[PDB]
Amino acid sequence: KEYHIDEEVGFALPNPQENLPDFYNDWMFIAKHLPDLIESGQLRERVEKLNMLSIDHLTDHKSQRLARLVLGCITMAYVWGKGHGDVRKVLPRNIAVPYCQLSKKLELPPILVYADCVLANWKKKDPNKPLTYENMDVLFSFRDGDCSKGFFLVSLLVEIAAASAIKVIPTVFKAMQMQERDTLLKALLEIASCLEKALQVFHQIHDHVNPKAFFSVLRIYLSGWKGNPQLSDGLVYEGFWEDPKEFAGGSAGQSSVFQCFDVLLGIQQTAGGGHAAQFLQDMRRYMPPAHRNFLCSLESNPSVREFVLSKGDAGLREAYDACVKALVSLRSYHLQIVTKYILIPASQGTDLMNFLKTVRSTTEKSLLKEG
Amino acid sequence: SKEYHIDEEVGFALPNPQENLPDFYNDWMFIAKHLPDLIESGQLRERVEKLNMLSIDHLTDHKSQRLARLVLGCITMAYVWGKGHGDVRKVLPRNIAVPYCQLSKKLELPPILVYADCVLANWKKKDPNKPLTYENMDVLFSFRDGDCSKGFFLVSLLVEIAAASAIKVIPTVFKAMQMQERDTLLKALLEIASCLEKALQVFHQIHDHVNPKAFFSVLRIYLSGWKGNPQLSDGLVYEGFWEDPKEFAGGSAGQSSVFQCFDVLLGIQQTAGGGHAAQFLQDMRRYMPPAHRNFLCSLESNPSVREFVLSKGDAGLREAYDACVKALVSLRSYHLQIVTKYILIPASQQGGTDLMNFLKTVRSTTEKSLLK
Ligand code: HEM
Ligand code: HEM
Ligand SMILES: Nc1ccc(Cl)cc1-c1cn[nH]n1
Ligand SMILES: Nc1ccc(Cl)cc1-c1cn[nH]n1
Numbered sequence: 160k161e162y163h164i165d166e167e168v169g170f171a172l173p174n175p176q177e178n179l180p181d182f183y184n185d186w187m188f189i190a191k192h193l194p195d196l197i198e199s200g201q202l203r204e205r206v207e208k209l210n211m212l213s214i215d216h217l218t219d220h221k222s223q224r225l226a227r228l229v230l231g232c233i234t235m236a237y238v239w240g241k242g243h244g245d246v247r248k249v250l251p252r253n254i255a256v257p258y259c260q261l262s263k264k265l266e267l268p269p270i271l272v273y274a275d276c277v278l279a280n281w282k283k284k285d286p287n288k289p290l291t292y293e294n295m296d297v298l299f300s301f302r303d304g305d306c307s308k309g310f311f312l313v314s315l316l317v318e319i320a321a322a323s324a325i326k327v328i329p330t331v332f333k334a335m336q337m338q339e340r341d342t343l344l345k346a347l348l349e350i351a352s353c354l355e356k357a358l359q360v361f362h363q364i365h366d367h368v369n370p371k372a373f374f375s376v377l378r379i380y381l382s383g384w385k386g387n388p389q390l391s392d393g394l395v396y397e398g399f400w401e402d403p404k405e406f407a408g409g410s411a412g413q414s415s416v417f418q419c420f421d422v423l424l425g426i427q428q429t430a431g432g433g434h435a436a437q438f439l440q441d442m443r444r445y446m447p448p449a450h451r452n453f454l455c456s457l458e459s460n461p462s463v464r465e466f467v468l469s470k471g472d473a474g475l476r477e478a479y480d481a482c483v484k485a486l487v488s489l490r491s492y493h494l495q496i497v498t499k500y501i502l503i504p505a506s507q508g509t510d511l512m513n514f515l516k517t518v519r520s521t522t523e524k525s526l527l528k529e530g
Numbered sequence: 531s532k533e534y535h536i537d538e539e540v541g542f543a544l545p546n547p548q549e550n551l552p553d554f555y556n557d558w559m560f561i562a563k564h565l566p567d568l569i570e571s572g573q574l575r576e577r578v579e580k581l582n583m584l585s586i587d588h589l590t591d592h593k594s595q596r597l598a599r600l601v602l603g604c605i606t607m608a609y610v611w612g613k614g615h616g617d618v619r620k621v622l623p624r625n626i627a628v629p630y631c632q633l634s635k636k637l638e639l640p641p642i643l644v645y646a647d648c649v650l651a652n653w654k655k656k657d658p659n660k661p662l663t664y665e666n667m668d669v670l671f672s673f674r675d676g677d678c679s680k681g682f683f684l685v686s687l688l689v690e691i692a693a694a695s696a697i698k699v700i701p702t703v704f705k706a707m708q709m710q711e712r713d714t715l716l717k718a719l720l721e722i723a724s725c726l727e728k729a730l731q732v733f734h735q736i737h738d739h740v741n742p743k744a745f746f747s748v749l750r751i752y753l754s755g756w757k758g759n760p761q762l763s764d765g766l767v768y769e770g771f772w773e774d775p776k777e778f779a780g781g782s783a784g785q786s787s788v789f790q791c792f793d794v795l796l797g798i799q800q801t802a803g804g805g806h807a808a809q810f811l812q813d814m815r816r817y818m819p820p821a822h823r824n825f826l827c828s829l830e831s832n833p834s835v836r837e838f839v840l841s842k843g844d845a846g847l848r849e850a851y852d853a854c855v856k857a858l859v860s861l862r863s864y865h866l867q868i869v870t871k872y873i874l875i876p877a878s879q880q881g882g883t884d885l886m887n888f889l890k891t892v893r894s895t896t897e898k899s900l901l902k
């Protein structure tokens with residue numbers, strides 16, 4: 160179904176647009192040269208000299224997504240500046256207005272989001288070679304040596320690997336309805352295979368992302384203004400709203416591949432009123448609309464977990480457990496990554512580690528056997 | 531409409547709910563059916579505390595699990611709030627806390643009284659051979675004598691039913707857009723506007739059967755929850771189920787999918803943005819039966835009726851669309867007048883000006899969707 164889920168790249172926007180119309184060259188210059196303009200203290204001056212351009216000449220969807228990315232990166236650069244506390248609390252009206260206009264048109268909040276800086280922020284080097292890190296580049300970066308190419312592209316390659324399991328999801332629910340046991344068993348093993356491949360793709364992050372680079376540079380420009388003391392009241396989108404609005408910074412929780420497998424397998428991540436559930440439910444507000452619809456429509460289907468629990472079928476239970484264990488392997492490896500890239504650099508705060516352990520614990524206790 | 535538990539006659543209301551539980555649950559039912567006297571005489575909390583822990587497994591069909599949730603939910607409200615004078619109980623006894631919490635998880639609902647409980651599953655006909663009018667209806671449970679719970683619960687129900695007759699027209703709208711049937715779509719939109727206009731007239735009856743001071747001082751107290759409530763800043767302890775207390779919001783008509791589905795269908799992005807109103811309405815979807823929030827999800831997964839109408843240069847289609855938007859504005863404007871009379875004026879005779887601004891942002895979002 161057309162939930163904007165390509166069968167090759169999944170939730171990624173397939174072959175994103177690299178260039179806006181010439182009408183938007185003033186946007187594209189500031190975005191193309193964010194590291195240079197920030198380095199010379201010229202960025203904020205160039206943003207404030209902008210005319211208010213109409214979003215009307217952004218016709219197709221892909222050009223609209225590129226413009227959201229361009230404006231999202233400029234906004235983060237304008238707000239955070241050089242990244243050392245010199246912050247602006249008011250977004251100039253000539254960029255705040257078209258940004259908020261395009262954001263509402265695409266049902267996304269006016270802040271840089273995972274679907275912007277990952278799913279719409281890549282290109283093939285050679286269009287006839289496959290989707291490998293060596294054949295890929297990002298379209299925009301914040302500062303030189305911020306390892307944004309490593310962080311964005313590795314996340315994208317993990318997402319693409321997991322995406323090949325999504326084309327199998329309708330086979331699951333059809334087989335449950337048709338009571339096709341062998342079909343369902345094959346589908347589950349195939350999903351666990353793709354999730355286990357995504358873990359191997361995840362290993363690449365040590366080669367392309369440096370802990371100091373991420374923690375002190377890249378993490379700053381991805382921060383938001385919701386519960387942030389630096390902007391305690393939010394950001395004023397001058398010309399579009401009178402009062403400052405709070406919005407959360409980017410997070411892979413805004414990726415719908417990384418929530419749908421919990422939904423598919425009956426792992427109740429968003430159930431209840433806890434903080435982990437509320438966070439994962441909130442980050443859904445930051446996904447493209449087609450991605451929100453894919454999640455809640457999965458929750459409308461009969462439970463895969465209930466079906467397998469009722470069949471007395473060891474093969475079926477082992478295949479279901481294979482998928483759940485792959486999620487556990489992913490989130491356990493993820494806690495290793497967070498230790499290396501946030502915990503040990505902040506030693507030279509742990510609500511974070513409690514949240515990640517809560518989400519993993521919920522996944523592990525969904526296992527049918529083990530223990 | 532799919533198996534989203536849509537009755538075509540009463541909509542999202544539960545068709546003729548069950549009145550009596552298995553005799554295995556007479557201890558629950560005697561308490562719930564006698565809350566007015568048990569509370570006023572001061573027997574209630576003691577009787578709740580001396581209850582035996584009953585099991586849930588003897589509640590088979592959906593209609594009975596729902597009747598039990600309504601039973602335990604009212605008992606919970608009565609125990610927590612007592613005589614409604616500020617004496618609050620912050621621990622729910624395990625013998626009632628854990629059957630409630632179990633049955634709540636089985637129904638994918640939070641363990642607190644909800645709109646689907648005290649409205650959609652809290653009614654009966656007097657004469658089964660007569661229509662669904664107020665005179666021929668009654669509720670199954672109340673809190674206190676003179677709390678006006680019959681008028682409040684039933685008028686809300688009759689409005690939902692009047693609006694729900696438009697739901698059977700929703701499939702016609704999306705098929706008309708897909709088949710490119712301009713005349714069918716225009717007829718369907720006008721029909722939807724008709725049901726919302728009729729629902730506003732049903733709304734008028736609220737003044738006949740609900741009294742301001744009785745609602746503000748009595749009924750509103752028992753419907754209150756424990757989420758951001760200073761009287762239970764940390765929530766309620768469901769003894770023997772969760773070690774820690776849990777916060778859960780009070781009952782609200784925003785917990786009915788009928789009252790949010792027309793914003794969805796028309797493209798009023800009420801849950802969009804980060805404001806208080808958008809966050810409240812999205813959170814209240816977790817307090818809906820799963821079939822109801824599946825239905826809302828299904829509507830959101832359809833092509834935009836608003837984008838379709840805007841792209842056709844058809845003044846007839848735009849005016850039919852605007853008629854549906856106007857009816858929602860009318861309902862919410864009349865609703866603001868109700869809140870003034872039933873909350874604001876009584877409260878000034880014992881701040882909550884954020885309350886009117888909250889409702890006004892929702893009405894304003896509706897007005898801003900008019901095409902011309
Ligand atoms: C330098 C590397 C990374 C760091 C420092 C990091 C940091 C974090 C943190 C702190 C959280 C907790 C929620 C929050 O506060 O935002 C989180 C959650 C999450 N992260 Fe990352 N992350 C990294 C890499 C990745 C990658 C590459 C992916 C996927 C390709 C990923 C997937 C997720 C997901 C899905 C969540 C939501 C929790 C869950 O579903 O388990 N992380 N991450
Ligand atoms: C004495 C009568 C009433 C009072 C005092 C009242 C009060 C309120 C209040 C205070 C809110 C704000 C949300 C909250 O704080 O919970 C609200 C919202 C709402 N009310 Fe009621 N209400 C009354 C009757 C009704 C009835 C009969 C309906 C039947 C449909 C209704 C439908 C709604 C809806 C749908 C909302 C959500 C906001 C929106 O969608 O615009 N109200 N009401
Ligand atoms: N991989 C990511 C890519 C982009 C953005 Cl904005 C966030 C993340 C992320 C991963 N884990 N937490 N956030
Ligand atoms: N929750 C996830 C679901 C799917 C995939 Cl492929 C990865 C993750 C993940 C990665 N890091 N933390 N969680």
Ligand SMILES: Nc1ccc(Cl)cc1-c1cn[nH]n1
Nearest residue numbers: 645649686753781782783784
């Ligand atoms: N009509 C209602 C019926 C029942 C309950 Cl629990 C709440 C409401 C309501 C009205 N306005 N906001 N909520």
Ligand SMILES: Nc1ccc(Cl)cc1-c1cn[nH]n1
Nearest residue numbers: 693729788789790861862865
């Ligand atoms: N949002 C609504 C949607 C449908 C109907 Cl029938 C009524 C309302 C309503 C009533 N009062 N406030 N909102």
